Amino acid sequence: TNFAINFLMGGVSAAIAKTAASPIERVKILIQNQDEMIKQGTLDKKYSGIVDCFKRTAKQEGLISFWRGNTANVIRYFPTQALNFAFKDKIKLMFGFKKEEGYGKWFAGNLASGGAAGALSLLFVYSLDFARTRLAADAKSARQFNGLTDVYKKTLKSDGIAGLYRGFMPSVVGIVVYRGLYFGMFDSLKFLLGWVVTTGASTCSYPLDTVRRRMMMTSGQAVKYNGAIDCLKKIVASEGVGSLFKGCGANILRSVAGAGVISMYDQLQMILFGKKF
Numbered sequence: 001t002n003f004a005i006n007f008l009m010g011g012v013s014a015a016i017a018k019t020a021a022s023p024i025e026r027v028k029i030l031i032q033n034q035d036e037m038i039k040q041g042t043l044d045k046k047y048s049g050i051v052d053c054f055k056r057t058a059k060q061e062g063l064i065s066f067w068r069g070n071t072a073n074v075i076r077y078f079p080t081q082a083l084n085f086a087f088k089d090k091i092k093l094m095f096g097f098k099k100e101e102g103y104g105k106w107f108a109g110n111l112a113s114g115g116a117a118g119a120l121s122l123l124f125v126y127s128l129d130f131a132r133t134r135l136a137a138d139a140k141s142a143r144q145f146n147g148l149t150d151v152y153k154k155t156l157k158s159d160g161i162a163g164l165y166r167g168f169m170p171s172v173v174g175i176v177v178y179r180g181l182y183f184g185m186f187d188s189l190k191f192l193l194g195w196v197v198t199t200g201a202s203t204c205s206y207p208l209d210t211v212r213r214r215m216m217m218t219s220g221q222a223v224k225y226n227g228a229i230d231c232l233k234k235i236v237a238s239e240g241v242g243s244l245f246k247g248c249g250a251n252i253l254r255s256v257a258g259a260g261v262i263s264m265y266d267q268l269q270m271i272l273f274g275k276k277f
C-alpha cells in the first residue's frame with residue numbers, strides 16, 4: 001500500500017509546487033513567445049517586461065487567468081512518475097558505467113540515460129506540455145482556445161498528430177545539454193551552489209527551449225519553420241540573438257519561487273508525515 005500513497009502524495013507535493021509558481025511561469029511563456037503572438041494577431045503590442053506583462057494580463061483577463069493551463073502541469077505528474085518508477089533505474093543501468101572506472105564514460109552514460117529516458121517519457125507526455133504552452137500563450141483581447149480538450153481537438157483537426165509534437169527534437173537535445181551542463185558545472189564545484197548550477201544550466205540551454213516553444217506556437221498557423229535549425233537561424237536573423245533569451249529572468253524567478261514553496265511544503269510535510277513524499 002506504501003507505493004500508492006507515496007505516489008498520490010508525491011503527486012500532491014509536485015502539484016502544489018508547480019501551482020504556486022504558475023503565474024510567473026505563464027508570464028515566462030508569454031514573454032518568451034510574444035512575437036509569434038504578434039504574427040498571429042493574438043497580441044496587440046510587445047511586452048516591455050515582467051511587470052508590464054503582469055499588469056496587462058491582470059487587467060485584461062484577471063487574477064485566476066495566471067493559472068491558465070496549470071491543469072496540464074498537475075496531470076503531467078502521474079504518467080511521468082509511472083514511466084520513471086518503471087524504466088528509469090533500468091535505463092540507468094543500461095547506459096551506465098561505474099564512476100570509478102572513468103569520467104568520460106560515466107558522463108556519456110548520464111547523457112545517454114537522461115536523453116533516452118526523457119525522450120521515452122516525452123513520447124507520451126509532450127502533448128501536455130504542448131497544451132500547457134498553447135493555453136498559456138493565447139490571450140484574451142476572444143480567446144484562441146476554449147480549453148485543454150479544445151487545444152487537442154483543434155490542433156489535431158488543423159495539423160494532426162504532428163501539431164501536438166512541435167519542437168520534439170530540440171526538446172530532447174535541450175534535455176541532454178541541460179543535463180550535461182548541470183552535472184558538469186555541479187561536479188566542477190565541489191547548498192546554495194546548486195541553485196547557481198541550475199540557473200546556469202537553464203540559462204545556457206534556454207535558446208533550445210525558446211525554439212521549442214515558438215515551434216509549438218507555429219502549430220495551427222499557415223506559416224511554420226522548416227525545422228529547429230531553420231527556426232533558430234530565422235529568429236537570430238530577424239530579431240537578434242538576445243531574442244532567444246526572452247523569459248529567462250522570469251524563469252529564474254520561477255526557480256526561486258518554486259524553491260521557496262517546495263522548501264516550505266517540505267517542512268510542513270516533515271511536521272505531518274515522518275518523511276517527505
Ligand SMILES: C=C1[C@@H]2CC[C@H]3[C@]4(C)C[C@H](O[C@@H]5O[C@H](CO)[C@@H](OS(=O)(=O)O)[C@H](OS(=O)(=O)O)[C@H]5OC(=O)CC(C)C)CC(C(=O)O)(C(=O)O)[C@H]4CC[C@]3(C2)[C@H]1O
Pocket residue numbers: 080084088114117118121122125170171173174175178179182202205206208209210212
Ligand atoms: C530545452 C529545454 C530546456 C532544458 C531542458 C528542459 C527541462 C529543464 C528538462 C528537465 O529534465 C529533468 O532533468 C533533471 C535533472 O537532470 C532530471 O532529474 S534526475 O533524473 O534525477 O537527474 C529529470 O529526470 S527524471 O527522470 O528524474 O524526471 C528530468 O525530468 C525528466 O526527464 C522528465 C521528462 C518528462 C522531461 C525537465 C524540465 C524541468 O524544468 O525540470 C521539465 O520538464 O519541467 C524541463 C523544462 C523544459 C526544458 C528547458 C526544455 O524545454
